[PDB]
Design an enzyme around this catalytic site. Sequence first.
Site, mmCIF file in Angstrom:
data_model
loop_
_atom_site.group_PDB
_atom_site.id
_atom_site.type_symbol
_atom_site.label_atom_id
_atom_site.label_comp_id
_atom_site.label_asym_id
_atom_site.label_seq_id
_atom_site.Cartn_x
_atom_site.Cartn_y
_atom_site.Cartn_z
ATOM 1 N N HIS A 134 -29.406 40.225 41.834
ATOM 2 C CA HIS A 134 -30.424 41.301 41.838
ATOM 3 C C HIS A 134 -29.549 42.521 42.308
ATOM 4 C CE1 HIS A 134 -34.416 43.226 41.659
ATOM 5 N NE2 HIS A 134 -33.761 44.160 42.402
ATOM 6 N N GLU A 135 -29.173 42.734 43.257
ATOM 7 C CA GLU A 135 -28.521 43.749 43.913
ATOM 8 C C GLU A 135 -27.258 44.133 43.087
ATOM 9 O OE1 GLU A 135 -30.218 45.602 45.845
ATOM 10 O OE2 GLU A 135 -31.524 44.362 46.219
ATOM 11 N N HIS A 153 -28.292 46.296 40.204
ATOM 12 C CA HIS A 153 -28.093 47.765 40.564
ATOM 13 C C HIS A 153 -27.113 48.340 40.398
ATOM 14 C CE1 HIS A 153 -32.554 47.821 41.127
ATOM 15 N NE2 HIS A 153 -32.759 46.870 41.964
ATOM 16 N N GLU A 171 -36.416 49.090 38.847
ATOM 17 C CA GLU A 171 -36.694 47.820 39.390
ATOM 18 C C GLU A 171 -37.136 47.120 38.133
ATOM 19 O OE1 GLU A 171 -35.691 46.336 41.925
ATOM 20 O OE2 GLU A 171 -35.367 47.959 43.271
HETATM 21 ZN ZN LIG Z 1 -34.236 46.028 43.225
#
Ligand SMILES: [Zn+2]
Length: 423
Positions: free
Chosen positions: A223-224, A227, A262
């Site tokens: 997930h990171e 980003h 997000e």
């Molecule tokens: Zn996030």
Amino acid sequence: MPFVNKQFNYKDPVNGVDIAYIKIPNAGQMQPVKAFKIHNKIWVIPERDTFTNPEEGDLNPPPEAKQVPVSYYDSTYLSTDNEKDNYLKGVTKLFERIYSTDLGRMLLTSIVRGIPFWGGSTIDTELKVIDTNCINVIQPDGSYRSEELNLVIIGPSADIIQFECKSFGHEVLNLTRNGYGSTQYIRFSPDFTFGFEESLEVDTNPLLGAGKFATDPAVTLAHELIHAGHRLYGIAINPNRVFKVNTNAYYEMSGLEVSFEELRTFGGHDAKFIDSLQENEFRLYYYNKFKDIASTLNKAKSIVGTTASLQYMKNVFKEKYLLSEDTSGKFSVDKLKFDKLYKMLTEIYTEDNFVKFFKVLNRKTYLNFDKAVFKINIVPKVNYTIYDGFNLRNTNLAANFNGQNTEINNMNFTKLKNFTGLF
Ligand SMILES: [Zn+2]
């Protein structure tokens, strides 16, 4: 074949190359910290992050009556050599697990190619690296050398469970939103994970559930990394762009909003909360930013430093942004190639898709409520593997996500705090 060719040990002697004491461009002073270069352009710093933000150097927990709902403090975490060694091994293991999937290999490849653009010079004819996209490495002779990098994985700051992807800003340029990109620092820990509930109605309710299932740390890191991908290609969505959650009565009564960045990162149905009109606005906006970069490269005639030639860097960015070059040696942005890259970074690389690849149970939406935080140890192979995470094949944990079931695989999880009811 492995993403990390060497099995680093925290106590391995520094060599000034891939095991060295470094300083980050936090615009302040700091004692050098031991860091490990695990792959081209990627470093890991086994330290609590008291460096990227000068106002966040105290790990001590505020008074019990001043702490928030979803938070966890332990000023002593990651303070010993044994912990740092386990941190290093845990993080490298998750990179291997991610790299072992085609999606992870694609994402990591995109990240390595996403070198922050050289737009630090004030003279539009010269290309110059932005120093905040570098770290200072102590060489064997004691002198410092500047090295460009794309990603740094560092320990969390005071709140252990507040993972995030951050980077150093620019005086005028919005590096993560102008197509330029910047070095990404991910606050993350492989030593803790979160609990979620298997029933959607329970997981999205702030009053129910204790967190029966544990999130696979590989999804969390991925997930990171997603980003990071957005930010390295400078297409992250401005955090002021949010979705007024109107699909959850509990979010609504608190006026809770969630950023589009997000929702996009999670993917799946969450991404659908960003309407077609707004999605087009963003796509065209970044298309233009890429055009500006292409023109800047056309107007380049000189370059600073001798670490590479003007022609070498012009090509390195031609590759990153997948630009086209006409007979006159001019770069331009192709709509098809841009949409393909943009979509890859935003729709293909998502949390929901990584779940499909890891074959794990995971929250079904970003619009849920935290349940609990667990202490874990993924380093031992008897606990977690690159290939199966907690759901070890040929054991009672292989099926039905039994390995992520904290009630069945209770020896692998120690509940530290419950969040349910505190909202
Ligand atoms: Zn996030």
